[PDB]
Structure formats: structure tokens, C-alpha cells
Design a protein around this ligand. Structure first.
Ligand SMILES: Nc1ncnc2c1ncn2[C@@H]1O[C@@H]2COP(=O)(O)O[C@H]3[C@@H](O)[C@H](n4cnc5c(N)ncnc54)O[C@@H]3COP(=O)(O)O[C@H]2[C@H]1O
Lengths: 349, 349
């Protein structure tokens, strides 16, 4: 959805004065045809009759004016009401796939002028926004909340399964018994979880102010998921991979590519044919995930540790003395690494 | 009202199936916009979307189709329904003094194509017919009947005073005591009476089949008034005058010229400037009225009788033998003339 169009959508999103007025118009079953222009004098060819108002905008004024037949003309920033009860006359030759005089008029005028035109039928509760060659149907909050609440509840389920796969993989990592199947399975669920987030995003935006709690819920649920997926990619990719490259891997599986077993294993650098082979491939974590998230060791410094010990397994066997031989690790970071790992092994395994 | 428009108005007059449908539409508060054209193909630029029907017309079909939004397209003779639910798009630059999309659309389309377009709003009970640059509002029968009934009542009153004036003029005429004032007063009342008929005529025409009784009443009330007035003009005009000149005099006072005492006397060939003078001008009827109406003597032959005697007074002093000295008058005409005058003088004076 183009950004130039997303900007216009904000104009009638829950929270704005304009939307408050449109909600009331809908509740009263009045119809509405609103034309947003900047220079009223320049549309004497498409705007006919009505009353010249040139007054300050307000939700109550718009509502009251919508009681009359015809269209209302507002300024682009919704600060002035220019005309009311006007007859809009766009070029009849302009193609339109709309039905009815009001919507056909709205699409034609928007295409002809490159301006925003809002239409509301008397019987229905949707707001149709036309801008240039675009058409966006805005829904009432109740419909949006139902979809968003369902999506969140769905996300909770995926997240619960992600957490179980993660704790299981954690045990396998600490014991160095991880297979490519385990890794890919965890990444797959992580990619599916973030995809759901991406798909509900437009619903959230459209909710405007009414989407505050929904946003907070999405944040609490998916907080550090992205980072976690990036660290897993770095820890299990066939060959050393830069963080940015890992983040790009993530972005691709979250939008373009499809998170299938073989496909994920393929992008990780493993030449696998059948998904049954995944259980056959053994892999050892580099150690980034634990070093950063648990030992609180910056990636730039974690590279150094991996460069020397190569795997988490070796890192877990290294003494403080051993660890201090690494650039960037003093008695403090050496203790943190050593202690955080020995603590997890004892508690988890 | 041009004969051209008059023909179209008949299409929606009480009695037609079309009008029957429009009345139902009005009674149901549905709206309507109807475009009459014989070759739809040629107007495909002003007719958009909708449903192609091409079916035989019926009042029930038109009524049902009017439940949908948009416009209906019928053949000019109203025998076929071509489209329903269409969007009519006439040129926006066409000037119009109408209000609302529906009526502004109808006027522009009518001007643009030179055809008939019918508009009916849901809120009102009138039918607006637009043809070319003409606009005729058709009213419901109830409104028309009320106007027509009051006009008829008014005519009865004028006719009564007319008969009172005529009866008194009859006495004076027989006694040869007529003054210009007597004649003028009678003519003025007769002229005023016929003007009312002319003014109410359009209402009766617009009443269609529901105006049958009204036409009968008008005819019974004004049956022989025109002839009577023409004969009065011929009998009292300054100098001899033909039936054609008289008939023209009548038409002038019923439309163009105002029937004022001085104006009537002036047109009769009398030089007067004050109404008071009228009671000072003694006049004598030629005899045409009595010869034609009572003696049943053809005007052509009446000219001969007046040629010889000049006035009714002299005609009543003639004998059968004397009267027969006129060409066209035999013992029969002579008897009818002589006996009819003598009988009236005995009964009226
Ligand atoms: N060119 C045309 N072709 C076919 N039918 C025509 C027509 N123009 C008017 N009408 C018929 O008249 C109905 C009501 O017209 P109205 O102006 O009261 O009530 C209108 C008007 O206030 C508004 N509206 C529609 N088009 C407009 C325009 N171009 N400019 C300003 N207001 C418009 O939306 C209301 C409802 O529109 P809707 O079509 O549902 O309802 C229409 C339609 O069935």
C-alpha cells in the first residue's frame, strides 16, 4: 500500500475530528460526499451551486451540513469547510468500476483532480476513500477490533509453540545434540509468528487511536523475537554470517520467501534435498545467542570468542583463564560468560 | 405553450398508461428519472451501465423498475422499455437553473439531446417534464379539479350576469331605446366570460381524460356566446361590418385588447373619451341578431334584408309583401321574420 495513500488514510482514522464526524454521519444514516481541495477557486468547473461557507472546520459543523443533499468541500488539511450542498460534475468519460451516482462521481473526481474524495452511502457503514487512481475502504472500529483480537489470540498460540521449541532447542544446544531439523523447525515457527504480525499491521494502523492497546499487546508478545531469530541464523548458518546478512535473511522469510523446511535449510547454506535428511544433519551453535542474550557480550566481541573457541560447546569448557586470552574479555566478561553457561547447564540439563 | 411541447405533455396526461405508472410512483414516494429515445444506440454516450431490457412497456413494469436507483430509458412512443438502473451523464457545461442532481440531470439531458426527460422526486407529488429548452410541471388531478371547479363556478356567475344584461338589452332593442352604454356593458361581460374560458383551457387540457366532464360543462355554459357576441358587434358597430370583421373583433378583446368601456366603444367605431358619454349615444340594431337567431335567416341573406331596411325597427314595420321584395326572402322567410318579431314584442314588451 503506497505511502502517499497511507497519508490520506490517516485523515479519517479513529481519533481525528473528521472521523468523529463521519462516524456520526454513519450512525444517522445520512450519506456523504466530501471533496478535499486546497484552492477552492480553481475548481469552478467540477463544483457547481451550493453554499460558499469558508468557515473553520469542526465535527459538528460537518455533521450538520451532511443533512443537506449534495457534497461538501473541505480544505486538504481539514481546517476549513469551503462549500456545502454542491453538485460535483467530474468528466463522464473517465473510466469507473463503481456503482451508483455518488461512488461513480467520487472515483471520477478523484482521478480527474488527483485529490481526495470521500463517499459514504446512507445504508452502509463503510467509508470509501478515493485518491487519484486508488480506492481504500475503511472499516468501523468494531469490525477491526474483532479481527485484531483474533489475530492476537492466534499470535499467543504461535508464541506458546515457539517458546516450547526454544526451550527444547536450548536443552539440545547445552548438550550439543542439535540437528538441522531442530533449528529449522524453530526458525520456521519464528518466521510464521512474525508474518502474522506483518499481516495484521494494516488493521492496527487503520484502528488509529483505538489501536493503542493492540500495539502494546503485539509488542509484549513479539518483543525480542526478531533478535532471537537473527542470532539463531548466525549460530547455525553453514558458514560464518554477518548480523546484517542474518537480518536480511529474516526479512526475506518474513515477506518474500516461504518458510518451508528445505527452503530454510537451503538458505542457511546446507545442501539438503528431502526434509527427512534434516534429522540426519548435526550442527553446533557458534555461541552468539548465549554470549549476547545471556552473558551480555556485544556481538563485535562475541565474534572474537567464537573466532577462538569456534563453538558454544568449547566455550562452555573454557576456564576464566582460557576466556581471558580473548580480545575484549577481561575478568568481568570472562566470569559472566563462564558463570552464565555453567548456570544454564546445571539448571536446564 | 408551443404545439411541440403540448404533444409531449399528452404522453403523461391522465388516461395514459405512463401517467398511471407515474401516479403509482408518486404514491409510493419512489423517485424517477425517465429518458425517452427511439434509438438507444445513438445515445450510448449519455447512457451508462444499468440493465438492457428491450421489453414491451407496461405501467406495472415501469413502477417496479422505479424501485431501483438510477434512470429508466423508454422509446419515444412509450411502447418499449430499453434500460433500467442507468447512470445518465449529460454535458456538465450545459447551463441549468434546476436544483438537485436529478432535476439538473434531466434538464441538461433534454437540452443536450432534444428529447423528453421526466423527473420525479420522492418527496413531492409533481411531475417535471423537460423536452428541449422547455420545462413543464404537471400537477395531480386533485389540484387541477379544484382550480377547474372554481373557474366553472366563476363562469356560472359571469354567465348569469350576462343573461341578465342580454334580457334587458332585448327589451331596449325591441323598444328601440338602446344606448351605447347598454351594448358596451353587455359585450364587456361577454368578453370577460370568454377570457376565463381561455385562461382555464390549459388546466382542462392537462386534465386529460379526467377533464371530460369539465369540457362538457364549459361547452354548455358558453354554447352560443361567441356567435351572440359577433352578432351584437354586427348589429351595433358604427358602420356596416362583415361577420369576419366581427369575429376578429371578438378574438381581439378575448386576448390582446382589454375589454374596457371606452376601448370597446372605440373599436366599435364610436369616438368617445369618457365612459359617461356612453349613456348619451343612441344606437339601433341592424337586425342581424334577431334575423339569424330567431327568424333563422342565413347571414348571407340577412345582409340583403339589412341592405334594404337598415335597422330592426324598420324591419319590424314591414309587411310580408314588403319583406318579400328582398332577394332570398319568400313567403316563408317573410313570415318567419314578421311573425317572430311581432311575437317577441308582445311577450317581452
Ligand atoms: N445522472 C443521474 N443518473 C441516474 N440517476 C440519477 C442521476 N442524478 C440523480 N439521480 C437519481 O436520483 C437519486 C437521488 O438524487 P439526490 O440528489 O437527492 O441525492 C443524492 C445526492 O445528494 C448525492 N449525490 C450523488 N451524486 C452526486 C453528485 N454528482 N454531486 C453531489 N451530490 C451527489 O447522493 C444522493 C444519492 O445518490 P443516489 O444515486 O443513490 O440516488 C439518485 C438517483 O437514483
Amino acid at each position: 500500500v503506497p505511502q502517499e495513500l497511507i497519508e490520506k488514510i490517516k485523515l479519517i482514522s479513529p481519533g481525528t475530528e473528521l472521523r468523529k464526524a463521519l462516524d456520526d454521519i454513519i450512525n444517522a444514516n445520512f450519506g456523504a460526499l466530501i471533496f478535499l481541495v486546497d484552492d477552492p477557486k480553481k475548481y469552478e468547473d467540477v463544483i457547481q451551486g451550493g453554499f460558499w461557507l469558508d468557515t473553520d472546520f469542526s465535527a459538528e459543523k460537518l455533521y450538520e451540513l451532511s443533512k443537506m443533499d449534495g457534497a461538501i468541500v473541505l480544505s486538504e488539511d481539514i481546517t476549513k469547510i469551503y462549500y456545502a450542498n454542491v453538485h460535483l460534475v467530474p468528466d463522464p468519460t473517465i473510466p469507473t468500476g463503481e456503482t451508483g451516482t455518488r461512488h461513480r462521481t467520487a472515483e471520477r473526481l478523484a482521478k480527474q483532480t488527483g485529490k481526495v474524495v470521500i463517499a459514504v452511502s446512507r445504508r452502509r457503514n463503510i467509508i470509501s476513500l478515493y485518491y487519484k487512481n486508488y480506492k481504500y475502504v475503511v472499516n468501523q472500529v468494531d469490525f477491526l477490533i474483532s479481527k485484531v483480537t483474533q489475530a492476537i489470540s492466534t499470535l499467543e498460540k504461535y508464541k506458546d509453540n515457539f517458546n516450547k521449541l526454544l526451550s527444547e532447542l536450548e536443552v539440545l544446544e547445552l548438550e550439543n545434540r542439535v540437528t538441522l531439523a531442530d533449528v529449522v523447525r524453530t526458525l520456521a515457527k519464528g518466521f510464521e509468528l512474525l508474518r502474522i504480525v506483518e499481516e495484521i499491521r494494516p488493521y492496527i494502523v487503520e484502528l488509529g487511536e483505538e489501536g493503542r492497546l493492540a500495539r502494546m499487546q503485539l509488542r509484549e508478545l513479539t518483543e525480542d523475537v526478531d533478535d532471537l531469530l537473527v542470532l539463531l541464523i548466525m549460530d547455525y548458518s553453514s558458514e560464518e554470517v554477518e548480523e546484517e546478512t542474518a537480518q536480511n535473511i529474516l526479512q526475506d522469510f518474513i515477506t518474500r520467501r516461504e518458510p518451508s523446511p528445505i527452503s530454510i535449510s537451503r538458505v542457511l547454506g546446507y545442501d539438503v534435498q528431502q526434509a527427512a535428511q534434516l534429522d540426519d544433519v548435526l550442527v553446533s551453535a557458534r555461541g552468539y545467542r548465549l554470549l549476547k542474550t545471556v552473558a551480555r557480550i556485544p556481538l563485535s566481541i562475541g565474534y572474537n570468542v567464537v573466532r577462538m573457541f569456534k563453538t558454544l560447546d568449547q566455550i562452555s569448557k573454557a576456564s576464566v583463564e582460557d576466556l581471558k586470552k580473548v580480545e575484549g574479555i577481561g575478568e568481568k566478561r570472562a566470569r559472566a560468560i563462564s558463570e552464565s553457561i555453567s548456570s544454564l547447564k546445571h539448571r536446564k540439563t
